[PDB]
Every structure is written in C-alpha cells, then in structure tokens.
C-alpha cells in the first residue's frame, strides 16, 4: 500500500542544501587549506551537525591500491565524558583500523601513526563539549604536531568549556556561528521544505504569509523545528487520508509545544 | 541427485579473482624480486589468507628431473604459540622433506639447508602473531642470512606484536594494507558472487538496491560475511525448492548477524 511507504520516508531524515550549509562548506574549505583550527557554534537544532556530516561525505575517503585510505576529513562525535583513550579509539576506528589492548601511550602513538599516512588534514569534533578537560591537551597536540585543522563543534555550552582553558580558547578563537533563520530566507526554506522535502500528493502552498505565523510561533526559526513540524503534519495527513497538510493539521501539530 | 550435488558445491570454498588479490600479487612479486621483507595487515575475514594461498599456487614448485624442486614461494601458517622447532618443521614439510628426530639445532640446520637448493625466494608466514617472541629471531636470521623476502601476515594484532621488538619492527617496516569492500567495488563483488560462485539456475538479482541494502547491512564489507551469507542463503533456498535466492530467505539469514 502507498501510505506506509510514505510514512517510511517521512519518519526518516534527509539533507537539504540550505545556503547555511554552503556557507560553512566554503569556510571549512578555507580552514582546511590553512590548517586553521577553529570552532563552529550556534544554538541547538540549528543544522550544525547535518552541515558537518554533509562536509564529511563530499570529502569522502579515497582508496589507493594496497595503501591505507586517504581520508582528508575525519568526523567524530565523542561519547559523553570522552577521555584520551576514547578519543584515540574513535579516530583510529574511523580510519578503519582496529585498536588493540594497550596503554593510552600505545593508543596515542598508534593514532598519530594513522593520522599520518591516511593524510588526514581536518578533524571535526562534533559535541566537542563532551571532551574531558584533560583530553583537550591531546586534541591540541594533534592540531600543532600535525598539519591538521581541528574544528570544534558545539553550542554556547562549548564556549564555557573552552574559556575554562585559555590554551584551548586561544587556539580555537576563530569561529563561525549558525544563526536562526528569519524572513525571506525562512520563507525560501519553508518553500523548499514543501517542494523538495515533502513532495506531498497535493500542495499546501507554504509561501502563504498568514500560516507562516503558525510555523514561526512553533519554529522560532530553528530548522530542526521546521523539519520536525512538516513531517509530523504530513504523516498525520497521509494517515488521515488528507492529500495535503491542512491548516487543521498544521495548527494541531504546532500546538504540541 | 541435483540438490545434494549443488549443496556439496556451495558448502565448499573457491577463489574469486578480486582486484585486491591482484594488488597483493603484484606487490608480492615486487618484494620477491627485490628479496625485500615486508608485512601484510588487514582486518579479519578481509581475504588475506585466500590471496596468499592464490599466490603460492601461482608460484608452485618446479621439478627438474631428480633435483629437489625449485620452490620460490613457501607458505606456512604456524600453530598457536609456534616455537622455533615448530617453525622449522612447518618449513621443512612444505618443501617435501621429512623431519628426522633431533635437536632444535638439527632442525635449524636442516631447514637452512633446504631453503637453499630448493631456491626459496619468499617465505610467507600467515598468522605471524602466533609466533613466540623468541621465534622471530630465527625468522630474522632466515631473512638476513639467506636472501629471502619474509612476509608476515596478520591482523592489527600483528602490528602490536611487531612493535614490541625494535629489531623485528625495523626489518618489516614496509607494509600493505588489506581493506574492506565498499561502494562500487562492493556492488561489483556481489555481482561476481551471483555469477561466478553461487551459479543458481535463476538470477537472484543481487545487484538490486533492496538486495544490496540487506547485504551491505549484514556484510559490512567483509568478504567473509559476503561469502558465508550468500552460500548459506543459496543452500537454504535450494533446500526449499527455490531456484534462486529471494529477499525473504536472504533477510532470514542476514537477521542472524
């Protein structure tokens, strides 16, 4: 049946090439050329993690015959309270090596060995605020012992962690902020989410200026609210046998907050 | 009967001429020509052992009318905790000589004797991490005193064992990495298994995106998982009177991983 397959995509996640993502990708290209360590900051659900993943994918590992892969961009997200051993494990496993049993000293030396030769040139640490205060020293040592641009990604929660160590603060001072959208950029984004993401059976014409108040009141300009609303409404509409997102559905979803 | 004949075939093993096999063979040919010692490292079930077997079969012993055979490539897998006498016994029996009862010194001198005259150019030691640490000295002496390219094969556990002895580490510094399959290479490998390995009466259409999705999730790029899933799925399918693998049987197998 048709409806269950639409639900199976609408409960999924997708990537939309917003201009915010483009702007980050030009910036990360400049940092990767300069090997410039830096940070990406901005409120929750602003699209940072999805923009970072899109950068990983477009700069995927290149295979070379019988060599370790060339992996220009390594993306990791630490587990909470990430120590040095946890950091080294995530980096080495990302490069498709297996960690052996060993000391932190073994893990460090093995990680530095494979950060070389795999030709890593950027390290993106998402949820960089999950790093333990002692493991930033190893992150800093990677940044300056190798020609690697380390990009710390977090919310303003990260800046509190950063400013608690002036050696971290002074290495990651350069920054880019993901902001909330508004106005015509929000209108174009809302238009994109109808006509590119949902691709629903019958249009709702989400350029409409009045219902844009309903979105704004729930969405506050968070993309990660906007993308949530429409999938909730569309699944309900297609569950209810409505070929469009009706106002009665959008406002009911937007009322759950 | 048809069924038991097909089951007896699928139960077995075979060698598929994957590109990573050819890559290793050309590299081993270079190392053998130069008599350079080296190591082969890669994740478990990535195909290292089959590729090393395929090499020594392409370079099997040559008879010369009542001389001992010219045997340019020796392949051994040591048993666990292989001591020096075990190692010498492995090598001697490969060259078609019987080990007479004697001391380790007698075994060493006899092995050194028959590595000459058989004209051994390359010695491949698979599961080289099973060697006792004292046994590496005798492996180094074979590389040093005879002009023999010794190739250590193992997983990342070998790379840790080797780094516990600078004299071994510094001799086997050159390496080849065996990788997992992914992407287009994995899609071609699935196509080859359907055509060249399983050889069912009817096309299983394993190139299909829905089939690749199942296979990619369960195989994770390990050629060992790919082989042992598809053979078992074919055996299950034939046992049910199906003339091909189907999604339901394939999912039923893949669910066990």
């Amino acid at each position: 049946e048709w409806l269950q397959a639409e639900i199976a995509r609408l409960k999924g996640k997708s990537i939309v090439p917003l201009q915010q993502v483009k702007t980050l990708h030009d910036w990360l290209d400049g940092k990767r050329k300069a090997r410039k360590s830096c940070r990406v900051v901005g409120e929750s659900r602003t699209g940072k993690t999805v923009a970072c993943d899109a950068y990983r994918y477009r700069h995927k590992p290149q295979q070379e015959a019988g060599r370790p892969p060339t992996v220009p961009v390594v993306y990791i997200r630490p587990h909470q309270k990430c120590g040095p051993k946890d950091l080294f494990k995530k980096i080495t496993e990302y490069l498709k090596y297996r960690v052996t049993k060993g000391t932190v000293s073994d893990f460090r030396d093995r990680t530095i060995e494979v950060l070389k030769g795999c030709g890593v040139e950027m390290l993106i640490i998402d949820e960089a605020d999950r790093l333990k205060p002692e493991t930033f020293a190893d992150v800093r040592d990677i940044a300056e012992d190798l020609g690697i641009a380390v990009v710390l990604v977090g919310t303003d929660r990260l800046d509190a962690v950063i400013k608690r160590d002036e050696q971290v603060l002074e290495r990651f001072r350069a920054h880019l902020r993901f902001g909330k959208l508004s106005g015509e950029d929000f209108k174009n984004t809302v238009e994109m989410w109808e006509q590119m993401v949902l691709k629903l059976p019958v249009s709702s014409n989400l350029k409409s200026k009045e219902m844009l108040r309903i979105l704004t009141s729930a969405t506050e300009g968070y993309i990660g609210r906007l993308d949530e609303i429409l999938r909730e409404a569309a699944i309900r509409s297609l569950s209810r046998g409505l070929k469009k997102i009706d106002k009665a559905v959008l406002q009911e979803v937007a009322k759950e907050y | 009967e048809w069924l038991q004949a097909e089951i007896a075939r699928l139960k077995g093993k075979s060698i598929v001429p994957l590109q990573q096999v050819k890559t290793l063979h050309d590299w081993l040919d270079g190392k053998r020509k130069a008599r350079k010692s080296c190591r082969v490292v890669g994740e478990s079930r990535t195909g290292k052992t089959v590729a090393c077997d395929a090499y020594r079969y392409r370079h099997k012993p040559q008879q010369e009318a009542g001389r001992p055979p010219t045997v340019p490539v020796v392949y051994i897998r040591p048993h666990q905790k292989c001591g020096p006498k075990d190692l010498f016994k492995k090598i001697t029996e490969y060259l078609k000589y019987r080990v007479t009862k004697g001391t380790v010194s007698d075994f060493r001198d006899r092995t050194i004797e028959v590595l000459k005259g058989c004209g051994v150019e390359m010695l491949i030691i698979d599961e080289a991490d099973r060697l006792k640490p004292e046994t590496f000295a005798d492996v180094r002496d074979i590389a040093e005193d005879l002009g023999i390219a010794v190739v250590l094969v193992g997983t990342d556990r070998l790379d840790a064992v080797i780094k516990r002895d600078e004299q071994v580490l510094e001799r086997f510094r050159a390496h080849l990495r065996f990788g997992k399959l992914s992407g287009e290479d994995f899609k071609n490998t699935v196509e080859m298994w359907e055509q060249m390995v399983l050889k069912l009466p009817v096309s299983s259409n394993l190139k299909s995106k829905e089939m690749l999705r199942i296979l990619t999730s369960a195989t994770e790029g390990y050629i060992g998982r790919l082989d042992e899933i598809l053979r078992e799925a074919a055996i299950r399918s034939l046992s049910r009177g199906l003339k091909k693998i189907d999604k339901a049987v394939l999912q039923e197998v893949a669910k066990e991983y």
Binding site: V16, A54 | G183
Partner: peptide, 13 residues
Amino acid sequence: EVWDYEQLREEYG
C-alpha cells in the same frame, strides 16, 4: 537536490 542518510552510508561509506 536532497540526500538520504542511508544512501550516503552506502555511497560515500
């Protein structure tokens, strides 16, 4: 254009 995390897992992976 839009992409699926599951496609990207195969395609780039």
